Amino acid sequence: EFDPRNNVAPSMDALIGETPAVYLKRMNDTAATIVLKLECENPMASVKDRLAYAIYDKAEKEGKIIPGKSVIVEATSGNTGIALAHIGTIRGYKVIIVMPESMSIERRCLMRIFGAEVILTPAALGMKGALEAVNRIVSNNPDAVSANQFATKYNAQIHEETTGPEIWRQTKGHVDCFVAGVGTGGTITGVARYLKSVGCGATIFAVEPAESPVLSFVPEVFEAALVDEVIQVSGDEAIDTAQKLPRTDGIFCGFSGGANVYAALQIAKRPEMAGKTIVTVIPSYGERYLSTALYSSIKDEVFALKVLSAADI
Amino acid sequence: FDPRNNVAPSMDALIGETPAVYLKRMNDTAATIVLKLECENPMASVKDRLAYAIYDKAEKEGKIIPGKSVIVEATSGNTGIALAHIGTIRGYKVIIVMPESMSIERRCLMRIFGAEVILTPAALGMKGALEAVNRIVSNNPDAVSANQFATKYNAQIHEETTGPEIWRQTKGHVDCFVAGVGTGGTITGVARYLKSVGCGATIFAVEPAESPVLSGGKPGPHRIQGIGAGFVPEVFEAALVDEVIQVSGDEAIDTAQKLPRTDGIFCGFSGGANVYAALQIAKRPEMAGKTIVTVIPSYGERYLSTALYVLSAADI
Ligand SMILES: *Cc1c(COP(=O)(O)O)cnc(C)c1O
Ligand SMILES: *Cc1c(COP(=O)(O)O)cnc(C)c1O
Ligand SMILES: CC(=O)OC[C@H](N)C(=O)O
Ligand SMILES: OC[C@H]1O[C@H](O)[C@H](O)[C@@H]1O
């Protein structure tokens, strides 16, 4: 509705989306143009802000939830939980996040910082244990709702309505290729739906881990008919790319950003892609992953640094 | 350019023009409180602007030469991160000097952006880091100190960008501006801009009750990372400031812990201090119906491993 550069936003959820895009510069040694959609710039530092926004906005417009009455419940340890907790507290909903006790204490802490009730389930039960706990909570409290049921309904839709149109505007209607990893499938499905709807013939590439190539579970949100090709990227390739992006381009992202950019660079090296514009997504900001395997090699390096003697000063 | 409608040339082109948000649930006063969200900069702090200014203005003055100059600073704080970030983008070597006792996470972040990290013995404190910087600049003809506490570029960037942004966002309704003083660049530059447009806003500096040097007190250790350097920075212009508000560590922390739940604001210690101060000012009868602007300097995620959830100058 408003330019955030020129106005005061009514609340933090009003600053979700309309994220910037940037050219890949130093790392792009190819003949193609690579455009990064910076979902890492959302208020809670990931693409999942848009999904959480959709859930609260659309469910309330359909009368499925009421602030101060409905309780939003989800099994997650990821950015979706953070974003649900964030928007929930702003809008005055109780939020219950269920996750195994074996997940990172940092992720646990982030949910609690936004006042979510965090229900921890035994490590020995895994994600199944968290899903079972959610089922019990939702079934037994008439005012509890499952976020996942709304996420499934609204996920691709929000990307068709926001992410896609933004990309189209930012590139001035120039997209030859779109590359994105599949988590929930929302981003790739909603963007590809949008691009099809505006008559854009862009080729659509899904990215998945070589170590878990299930697209090659399949989320209900994901629409395989919109995808032209699957690129598999190894953990090592994703990590190497994410470790280099800060130095080459000042881009600080997670594992998925590394995978997406690696995939884009592989596509860009194809002769037929010369001079084409390839768009991909940086899903999340890197700082959330500082304690993970993504940056552990750098952590080991700085841990071992020598200290100057007083005599060398 | 409008970022909503164009592709940026580089990440340093997305610095500044940050959003602003009303403080709503936490604000029980008769004043309007506007938060300038410096936490939304690309490297998640106000220091992106200072780093941008240093590289942009130093190059325009010929004080750095691309592919020759090496940028040096003694810092484990946001200034070092931002210097390393813009340095690597522009192709400058960056050397960050810090006491060995500063956070390993901050050390790691400098190195992620390709800065060289020099560690100084903790028994020498910040003096030891400053001495190492002086040795680098004296002995290395190509080395240039960022000089964050004294450089003219600091207040200048805030006079040119942060101030005009606040003026535009509030549509010329700024009755009060409240900001914690680290380098003093933000408050000085914003106050300079507001003065230049004939705005009679009252200007409030915030400092730790534990280290109230702007108030004429003694330096001391405190938890409010980003502010309270333990001396009066050269950048800071006391003549522009109407009052200094002291905030305790406990008050700053309490506020920063509540802001995420009340208003979805996820910030560090200094954002808590600023908001606490703004709310204290806002209770004054003369502030009824007035617009008070303060700053959220940095995003909260950088503080997850800290106490939030002297060495003070090194945390800037
Ligand atoms: C959500 C997410 C993705 C995938 O986006 P989808 O819309 O779920 O397909 C991958 N990376 C990160 C870090 C994200 O949070
Ligand atoms: C730099 C810093 C400030 C203070 O800003 P100055 O312009 O240096 O006075 C406050 N808090 C944080 C987190 C900082 O990094
Ligand atoms: C990877 C991420 O942060 O998101 C994944 C998803 N939000 C989950 O519940 O795991
Ligand atoms: O890039 C600046 C950081 O704070 C902002 O909120 C972004 O989401 C990101 O995590």
**Ligand index nearest the alpha carbon of residue A190:** 1
How is residue B250 written in tokens? 């406990």
Same domain, residue pair B270 and B167? yes
Question: Per the domain annotation, does B127 fall within a domain?
Answer: yes
Ligand 4 proximity of B40 Cβ (cutoff 6 Å): yes
Ligand 1 proximity of A257 Cβ (cutoff 6 Å): no
Known binding-site positions of A for pyridoxal 5'-phosphate = 79, 183-187, 256
Same domain, residue pair B83 and B133? yes
Burial class (CB in 10 A: 0-12, 13-18, 19+), A272: exposed
**Ligand index nearest the alpha carbon of residue A182:** 1
Cβ-based contacts of B117 with chain A (< 8 Å) = 302, 305
Dist. CA B300 → ligand 4 center (Å): 10
Residue B298 lies in domain: 11-40+162-315
Q: Please say whether the beta carbons of A238 and A257 come within 8 A.
A: no
Experimental technique behind these coordinates: X-ray
Q: Would you call A256 a catalytic residue per the annotation?
A: yes
Task: Write the CB contacts of B143 (distance below 8 Å, at least 6 apart in sequence).
Answer: B69, B70, B71, B72, B95, B136, B137
Same domain, residue pair B194 and B263? yes
Q: Please say whether the beta carbons of B109 and A290 come within 8 A.
A: yes
- Cα–chain center distance at A95: 20
Same domain, residue pair B130 and B86? yes
* Distinct helix (H) and strand (E) counts, chain A: 10, 11
Ligand 1 proximity of A258 Cβ (cutoff 6 Å): no
Same domain, residue pair A70 and A94? yes
DSSP-derived secondary structure letter, A309: P
Question: Per the domain annotation, does A305 fall within a domain?
Answer: no
Question: Per the domain annotation, does A89 fall within a domain?
Answer: yes
Same domain, residue pair B30 and B56? no
DSSP-derived secondary structure letter, B202: E
Of the residues B145, B175, B190, the one at which a domain ends = B145
Same domain, residue pair A130 and A23? no
Question: Per the domain annotation, does B155 fall within a domain?
Answer: no
What DSSP letter does each residue of A14-71 carry, written as one string?
Answer: GGSS---EEE--TT--SSSEEEEEEGGGSTTSBTHHHHHHHHHHHHHHTTS--TTT-E
According to DSSP, the residues that pair with B176 across neighbouring strands are B202, B292
Number of domains into which chain A is organized: 2
Half-sphere exposure at residue A265, Cβ-oriented, CA atoms within 13 angstroms: 19
Interchain pair B3, A12: CB under 8 A? no
Closest chain B CA to residue A296: B108
Query: Which of A3, A41, A109 is opposite residue B309, by nearest beta carbon?
Result: A109
Q: Please state the φ and ψ torsions of residue B63, each to the nearest 5 degrees.
A: -90, -15
Neighbour order of strands in the sheet with B143-145: B116-120, B93-99, B70-74, B143-145
Question: Per the domain annotation, does A128 fall within a domain?
Answer: yes
Give first-to-last CA distance, chain A, whole Å.
57
Hey, what long-range contacts does A256-259 have (CB within 8 A, 24 or more apart)?
A256/A181, A256/A183, A256/A283, A256/A284, A257/A40, A257/A281, A257/A282, A257/A283, A257/A284, A257/A286, A258/A294, A259/A181, A259/A207, A259/A209, A259/A233
Interchain pair B107, A302: CB under 8 A? yes
List the CATH number of the domain containing A171.
3.40.50.1100
Cα separation, A126 vs B225, whole angstroms: 38
Q: Please say whether the beta carbons of A131 and A75 come within 8 A.
A: yes
Same domain, residue pair B116 and B95? yes
Q: Would you call A48 a catalytic residue per the annotation?
A: yes
Question: Per the domain annotation, does B273 fall within a domain?
Answer: yes
Query: Which of B4, B21, B110 is opposite residue A9, by nearest beta carbon?
Result: B21
Task: Give the E-state strand segments of B107-234 in sequence order.
Answer: 116-120, 143-145, 176-180, 202-208
Ligand 3 atom closest to Cα of residue A288: 3
- Largest Cα separation within chain A, whole Å, is 71
Hey, how many other C-beta atoms are within 10 angstroms of the C-beta on B92?
A: 22
**Ligand index nearest the alpha carbon of residue B81:** 2
Same domain, residue pair A16 and A164? yes
Check A37, A46, A48, A70 and give the catalytic one. Answer: A48
Q: Which contiguous run of DSSP H or E holds residue B34?
A: strand B32-37
Cβ-based contacts of A83 with chain B (< 8 Å) = none
Cβ-based contacts of B110 with chain A (< 8 Å) = 302
Closest chain A CA to residue B306: A106
Question: Per the domain annotation, does B154 fall within a domain?
Answer: no
Same domain, residue pair A35 and A179? yes
Q: Which residues of B participate in catalysis according to the annotation?
A: 47, 270
For chain A, give the number of residues: 313
Same domain, residue pair B267 and B201? yes
Burial class (CB in 10 A: 0-12, 13-18, 19+), A140: exposed
Cα separation, B151 vs B63, whole angstroms: 12
Closest chain B CA to residue A298: B108
Task: Give the E-state strand segments of B212-301 in sequence order.
Answer: 243-247, 291-296
Cα separation, B297 vs B33, whole angstroms: 15
Query: Which of B118, B263, B301 is opposite residue A287, by nearest beta carbon?
Result: B301
Ligand 4 proximity of B39 Cβ (cutoff 6 Å): yes
B197 in helix, strand or coil? coil
Known binding-site positions of B for pyridoxal 5'-phosphate = 78, 182-186, 270
Question: Per the domain annotation, does A111 fall within a domain?
Answer: yes
Interchain pair A171, B7: CB under 8 A? yes
Known binding-site positions of B = 78, 182-186, 270
Same domain, residue pair B64 and B181? no
Closest chain B CA to residue A40: B42
Cβ-based contacts of B173 with chain A (< 8 Å) = none
